From Swiss-Prot, chains A, B, C, D, E, F, G, H, I:
Principal location class: host cell
Primary role: Major component of the virus occlusion bodies which are large proteinaceous structures termed polyhedra. These structures serve as the protective package for the virus particles outside the infected host and allow natural transmission of virus between insect hosts, assisting persistence in the environment. Forms the paracrystalline lattice of polyhedra and interacts with enveloped virions as well as other accessory molecules and structures to form a mature viral occlusion body.
Result after altering residue 18 to D: Forms a single large polyhedron
InterPro entries, alphabetized: Polyhedrin (IPR001746)
Originating organism: Autographa californica nuclear polyhedrosis virus
Similarity comment: family membership: Belongs to the polyhedrin family.
Name of the protein described by the UniProt record: Polyhedrin
Localization terms from the record: Host nucleus
Length: 208, 208, 208, 208, 208, 208, 208, 208, 208
């Protein structure tokens, strides 16, 4: 008889492998929970779509925003979506998600990716790079990058230097194909939000 | 024939999955060691017990200490237990552990939990919240939160701003039960300590 | 039919366990990629060899460099090896690797290790310590420690306080043997480098 | 190749185990058919509901009817339900069925039961007894007791001493729980009826 | 290692399931022995053959003897077969056996049956009935009904009211066929006899 | 997922085969619980020991009590053992148990048995009989016969004709051995008692 | 693909285990052929039968012949059986075989044995000994002892000191029984004979 | 169903492989019983201990006794241990046993051995030899050599030339190690004794 | 966990079956090592080739040497091959090996063999014999016969009666074929030599 045990490391949740396996020694080892399937709400903010044509053995730049622009877009899209933020909450993490798909059917290849977190706004990335020990994208065709480590306006957001809490990402996408491949990209931010909503109703004013 | 390999990431230890499995490709992947079963000493400082009665679809606040109080309690209990600290040592991590059990027998439900690390002393948490995408507690009925990222007194501890090394936690506990459940909680701090004790005896003075 | 999915956490890459297993629910859990087998280039800078004779239940200090010396050696060896650094690149991580082997054949024991990251240059470690809840080294006989978290000279490297980006390590090695064991150690730094090389040729000057 | 064989013992039907198993020596042995799934019609006459709160290691009396009352209730409910009894039929058996369920969710325990058939109307049972070598109720949470071994009125039913054909039951219910348990009981009579309906139509009068 | 155990209930023999299975916990349960394969002699008294043509969804009456006639036939056939009854014996049970077979080849259907034990001589059964929750006859095509619960003549047999020891049966046979089926029936009585024959020879008179 | 279900037939308890098997369709069939392992208390009243020497193909009479003597012995031993009978109780059944063992080691044979329930006090059984379709005794070497279907004295017991509730047994034991076998027999009565003990303490008089 | 190989050691034949197993590394090992199933003719000379009654923990002497008598019996029986010895032949070995069986049925025990080869004619063995680390006889109930390591008369046989070619055996037989056991013994000599018969016919004289 | 069969060859006992395997055609082959586990008493006479340091690819002489000395030591130790020899007995065989163990822990290698039986007292063996097609010692770390093929004094033992019954052994021990290995040797003689003890008590004199 | 154990019987080496099997109770039994694969050097002295044509059910004589000739050939070939014999050595055994092969392809039959060891030089064997309980030759097509149980010249070899150490063999070969078969035979002697070579170099004279 195996017992389940959990650990939390900076909002990354883990469970003992032996208890995960038994579901139908290994127990002394832990496996991390999928962040999107794990604790906290998922909030997907889709930023844009983009078509890129990638040559074999290369990868193209997906996004080249300046730091100010990255923060403007992030804050604006997040606040536009969220307001009103009614309860105390914690942003556990933010993932830059790159979703990729072929524009043509009957193609079989794997997607490859590489990113850089820092970097700084005072840097212009190459638009096209060579493939060098890339990350292999899984069959869900999504590359998910963790960016981690009360505001009325973007000006306030900057003044409270809250932008120091997360990195400005740049991402490159390519394929293991031996031909040029046209790819449709969808770039999103997925926020992991931990909400602390009181067990209290919403009343029409005046209450009681 | 598989070969075992290990890695250390900020005092989190990992081993190749293939070598963990073989114990009786997968090898290219790593699994983390259970922190309490892994390297370093375990030091459990039990802080208090508390009874909470939790309504379905809610979670109750376990601890609401101010920052100063959290640090007072942590430093006091740790130093009271440890003194004398005879050897060079490193606190690898500190876990806030919440142990939960029903106060009545013949109940079958799972425990649910959520915490927040930061937060700040200038914040009063709700005593009761709604369950929203919680962490599912394993069958060991324990929720373990990592808090990470030479002092004669607490005043010195504060003066050396050593409190900046770890977060002040707040934790909520609930159940997946459809009835109210009375639960007995035990809150502890488990320190992971790496001791560097010389191969040297203790002599009665004067030595030699 | 299972789908593969990937996540990146501060240059640590993860894949869903279910998709790793299927290679010939579990899917909701992630396993980390071996760093040396994962994305980014590997760059091994071998620093020195050392023979140590270790008594049972003890571990001996492998390296006792001052902070300035650790940084001098690291910067010098890295730049000597790398120059010219032709493309934009990011050092994802640096691992202090300790490779160990017996000096005599027909010995069967396991290696044990412990390290400390911080520490500071103003500290002298014990040369010999007792074994206390150590890390168990795998059959590859290597202990790999992550140290993480444009310069013409070492003076510039220090002036830009780039040394604050990674820890000064101290490492101890022992065995689970019941006799003294003579061991040959090889200490290296393995850099994980993410290179952003443009899809552009090298021309003999003048170009075009 | 196995052959199926059947036997009937006082309206209890049996089949050879080997033929029951083969369905996808053992054959020399018989297994009885579930009475409710076996031959004859099922006729459930639900008598009442009752809430009982049972202390650990005890069982409470479900029903304490006098003989006359048991027969009054049985005859009345059966005739009220059945009339008109259009065809020759045989009551094969009558089961006193006790259905039990917790009044609260998230409880896990087993139900326990004990009954007594004879007994007589001139006896008052204890309302609460101790658990002594009880019958363990299955996961269907039902205790089914066989009671076995043309009337216009109850007076005629008594005059023909037809009540001598079946026992007046008293039943106790408890749990293997270590806490008090509130339980909702439903008491029914399930008649097993063997109907001999001629292959003859019902005509509007006058026939032909 | 499992141990075999036996029980007898009113001449029905049982063995523990676990010991029956092991032949190549379950042990706590019993299975009954096939009566014809179990203890006691088998004595088959074949009474008559009969052809019946049965319409779908119906069953036809096999035998409609008056009580006196049933007892006359039973006593006569039994005594005619048995005499002389040389040893003390006990009739354990008597089975009314109905053996059925199609009169035409290449038919595939199952036989269905229903009987009634009491009943009384002052009752005329329907010759044809509808199929209602029947007993399903096994592939041996035999329906076996237990009838249970020193005479020179039938008059004595009646005078000693020995007929009260067993029921007068009426049996119906049908099929699950969707066409009319012609069936040949063979009706027998199988007596289970327990003989107490002394270990004593038969001598030609005078003995010794 | 299978559900457990139970039935009671005249104090014989049954469970669905499918739920008994699953313990690590078949479900539609029932298996009976071992009476000694099933509900109700066990009360073994050992009556006597006896040595019998049995010739091949024969069985010897174990007990030849007259009816009055059987009832005298049963009532006396039961009341002597039981008094005081403090609570309402029901004798569910009484088993005549014959335990047999060889008087010599290194013998390998099976025991065989036959009994007769009725019989009457006005009958003298043969002391030795021939083996004819016997019951095969299991490896527990016990033959268990069910005998079923408030008194200060045996005279009262007889006056209330309570002896009509159970049969006077006669039992024969033999072996399948090809040599004479000396056997030690132990004859007991095992009562199955269903006790209805109130949840009430015993107080020293006067109470309260 | 395995290859069969054979070896002969002083008329003991061996085959590689791997080739014996494969019949449907281990190959480097040999197994000996059963002598009676292996090369050479079998010639069983049955000498006598004897009944012995053996007490638990003891063994009785089977044969106590003087050397001269053993040789007389062996030579006489062998020559009586064999003459004429028509072809060149070699006696490969001679086995003293003791065949044992119970005189009574339904006994279950194992036979035990011990022998002594030398010994000499000038020695009188105990008739009864205690069992001390005996040889366990297999289920064939035979103990086979190898005795190894042109004559017209026994006088010539002795004169050519051919008796020096094989030992005079004494054998004891017992059982692992806890009771006395009567056993029937059959003592034989089994000669293994290798015949060198020419490919030449037998003609009626005169030939050609 | 397989039958067990046994053979004895000069006090070596054999059983059919098929009967040894079945324990949970192959049957035609025999396997020998372990001599120490087989028939006859074991009598271990430990002679001495010795430390030897063996260089790779070599073996060192364990014992270099002259013939007279070997016989003196054997006779003396055997008689000293045995006297009084109360019963007729046969020495079935004598094994020179060499038990070896490392003097240091954490060594992993196999032991290798070679011996010579004849030889003669007029020969001086090399103290150190090279390893040439040695015998590989099993994991029990014991090399067991059979030496086979009434005395008041050693002088009598020699006069009766009983020393001609067994060989004077010389043994060499080495390892498959690639380093020098210090080994502790224990040299013993294990006698296999077949005792013929009468079933007769020991009485205090005078008997009867 | 099984332990390996070894025994030596007159230069025949054995290992426990259980330890041989485990390589990927049985342990109490031993298997012999293949002599050619076991300890000691192999030295094959090929003597001659010979073609024989064998009729069904017969075997032909392979070699008919006189004793003097067998010893002349053996000594001459052995000394011619061996000289100089530089180290102390022991001839463990000598095998007469008969290697057989068909002279024509596409034949499928098994080889059969029989030999005789003693025999004597004063005997002329039949050239052709009938097949009688032969030895079956394995698929390696080799028959290997053990012959067991310092000389400058053959005259000295005879004078020291060293020829008494091993038998003069005669061997017959046939087939299980139903046609005549032409076979090519190769007869060799394989010596098993145990060499005692000192750990001492060979120097050019004068040494040192």
């Amino acid at each position: 008889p195996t017992i389940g045990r959990t650990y939390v490391y900076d909002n990354k949740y883990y469970k003992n492998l032996g208890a995960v396996i038994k579901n139908a020694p290994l127990d002394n080892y832990l496996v991390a929970e999928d962040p999107f399937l794990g604790p906290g709400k998922n909030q997907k903010l889709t930023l844009f779509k983009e078509i890129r044509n990638v040559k074999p053995d290369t990868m193209k730049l997906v996004v080249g925003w300046k730091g100010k622009e990255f923060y403007r877009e992030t804050w604006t899209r997040f606040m536009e979506d969220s307001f009103p933020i009614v309860n105390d909450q914690e942003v556990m993490d933010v993932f830059l998600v790159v979703n990729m798909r072929p524009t043509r059917p009957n193609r079989c290849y794997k997607f490859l990716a590489q990113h850089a977190l820092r970097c700084d706004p005072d840097y212009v990335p190459h638009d096209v790079i060579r493939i060098v020990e890339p990350s292999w994208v899984g069959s869900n065709n999504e590359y998910r990058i963790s960016l981690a480590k009360y505001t009325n306006s973007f000006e306030q957001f900057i003044d409270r230097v809250i932008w120091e809490n997360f990195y400005k990402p740049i991402v490159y996408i390519g394929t293991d194909s031996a031909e040029e491949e046209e790819i449709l990209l969808e770039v999103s931010l997925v926020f992991k939000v931990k909400e602390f909503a009181p067990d209290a109703p919403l009343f029409t004013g005046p209450a009681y």
